[PDB]
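Below is how a single chain appears once it has passed through the pipeline. First comes the sequence as given, then the structure the pipeline wrote out for it. We keep one example in the README because the format questions we get most often are answered faster by looking than by reading.
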Amino acid sequence: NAHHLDHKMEIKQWKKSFLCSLVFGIPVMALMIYMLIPSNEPHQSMVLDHNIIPGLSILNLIFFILCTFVQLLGGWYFYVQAYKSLRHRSANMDVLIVLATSIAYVYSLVILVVAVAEKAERSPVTFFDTPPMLFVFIALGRWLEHLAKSKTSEALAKLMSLQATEATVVTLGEDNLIIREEQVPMELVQRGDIVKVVPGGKFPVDGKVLEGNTMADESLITGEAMPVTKKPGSTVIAGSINAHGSVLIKATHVGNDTTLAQIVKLVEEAQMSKAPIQQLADRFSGYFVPFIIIMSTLTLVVWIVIGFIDFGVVQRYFPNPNKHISQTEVIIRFAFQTSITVLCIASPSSLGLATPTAVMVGTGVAAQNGILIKGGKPLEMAHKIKTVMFAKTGTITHGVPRVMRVLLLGDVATLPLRKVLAVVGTAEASSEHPLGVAVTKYCKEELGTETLGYCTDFQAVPGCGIGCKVSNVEGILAHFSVLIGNREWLRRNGLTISSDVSDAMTDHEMKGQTAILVAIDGVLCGMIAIADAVKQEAALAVHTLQSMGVDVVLITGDNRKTARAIATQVGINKVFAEVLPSHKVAKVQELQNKGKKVAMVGDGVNDSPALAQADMGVAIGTGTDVAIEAADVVLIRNDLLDVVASIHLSKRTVRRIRINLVLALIYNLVGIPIAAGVFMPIGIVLQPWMGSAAMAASSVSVVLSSLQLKCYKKPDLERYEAQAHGHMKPLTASQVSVHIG
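Resulting structure:
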């Protein structure tokens, strides 16, 4: 487990290989620098290059000895990978390395065999010091870029290796009295067991608190910086840290069913859906290396043909025609040096891993603050979103309503205040709507009676209203056809509604207090007020998106007047009201009909068809419920500011996508003419050993450009109302547009 993300074996192997290459690279460095820097009073004027036999200088013998070893002791790895790639129908960078070393060991050996055969008094300059300098600067570069590839998977490494493996289960007799205790392994612990915890221990299972009061912190899991207080009957998370003594819990989710496993599963899969930009960078990177061979070997022919056709062109560029070197023996060597440098300076890895490292670092940084962007396609999608769509219930409001004002409009004598709420409560209890549970709990806490009536013929039409009959209500009396719905609910059954009550119910409707209609047995019993408080983060979340340049729009199933009432409370322009949850897609299909990219800020299971139809889905508030298929962006914390911080961070990751792909093209397209030998007129050309040190400092530089994303402080509140200070205006409902048709 986590060995794929560890990179430990590659680090060990490349460090060992680099240390193995160092012991042979240091002597070549020492000899080259000793020959390079002259002394003021040399002992014998560099005696170390005294020829022993005509053709083979004593320095070239040492270089040959030191290079043959490295050719077959430190270079068989690249030979093996090149052979295994030639077994395939494609190539690799190891093909380039094998070519660059084979040429430098074949031509530089033929040029010395020729000098030995002709018994020349001077041993020519040979390409025998570059293979000892190629591998050190390649092994070091690979070791450093693998080390920098780590610390990109730091989030995944700290998340996967976060859950515990031993849990202290306990058996309770009747009143949590201890029967025995064991430490069951995680591989076989089952749901329903009772697990204790030690002071300072972990909460390894998602479950419910049995008894005892204790606060725990799970900052490394979700991201909050405060220890949440837990009471008997609350929910614990798998991975937290116990603080106060021992608590007893009942297991609910064990194994892959826990949230942390779901988070890891989602993050890992996020880097699988490659964006079309990555697909294009893959299609043009398959035909990249053969382009390098074809274009490099063209230079080798070019220099030779220009030398044999017009040697006088380069004659002025070659300073010293000596007796030991002919006009041809100098053009050939330069042609081969340039040819080797061209295909030894290209860095395909800087173009291959340009995007994936940036995507991985961005996703990992996001996952540390609750933001849980999935897929590579939504990453670049957030760059080109013009319009964002918001939901009302569960996204901008808290989600927990209550009852504020209750009035009676019928007759007090036959419909007293004691049973009018009881009948509607026992009617709505059969409904699962949050309105029903809110009114039922309000009635229970107000009347104080644990009992209720009985409801029959419970007809429930979603989005419009309900109708039923209630009886057996005499239980609370010791201390009836019912139709509940909206304004149009009581029209199609032919029952009138007065105008004053319509004015009365609109009085609280303007204030964001949605008011439900009560009518039992054809009598206008009274009017009921319900509302949900908008989160305090709604004012600034929209204000930034409009400031950033992304259009906003609200969709909601309630009536039109509440839509404008709730729009001004947050500051939206266009709103979609009077929509039943049947379609949810006709609205997206007409925002997207213009050709724009649309993204809905949903709430979870209730908006699955709309989020899937939309290009980007924001599932906010889905605490401990990460498993969502329709949405492509999931937010663990119910924090509306994170919507800003998701697109804000997504563009930054996409910003580094191009930067990495530009440094991978600048380096290649600038590294060719310098290596191609076009800079003889200026007078700067590269020895091949300098063509690999530039490659090592390229792959690391690409990765080090990605690790700069990790130093991303999460913008807290005080930063947000800093750039949003002084320019923000709440628009009235007069400048508000609504749906058409």
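The CA atoms of residues 160 and 264 lie 7 Å apart.

See the next section for the split statistics.
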